[PDB]
Amino acid sequence: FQPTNGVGYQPYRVVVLSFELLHAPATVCGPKKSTNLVKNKCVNFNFNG
Amino acid sequence: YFKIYSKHTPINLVRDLPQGFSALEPLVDLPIGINITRFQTLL
Q: Which residues are modified by glycosylation (chain B)?
């Protein structure tokens, strides 16, 4: 690899993420962001589980 | 799931377990998957 090489021949760092599910509890989870909560009003809610 | 519950209390007795009631709260819930068979203590 040289700095003067063509961009087609320049070095590129590659990372391949694979997600493996087995016969075991799922332990890697996403962020799962939340929203604001409102009181004294009929709401359909989704708490932790 | 590997549940580990615990509880602490004072005691004044040596030769046997104390008679009485007390509940044990949950402390650890390990998300592992190692089918256990045996164990051992370390003192």
A: 35
Nearest CA in chain B to A22: B33
- Residue A7 in tokens: 């961009």
CA distance A27 to chain B (A): 7
Experiment type = cryo-EM
Residues of A within 8 A of B1 (CB-CB) are 25
**In units of Å, what resolution does this entry have?**
2.8
Residue given tokens 């044990």 in the structure block: B24
Structure tokens at A21: 């599910």
Strands (E), B1-43: 2-6, 25-30
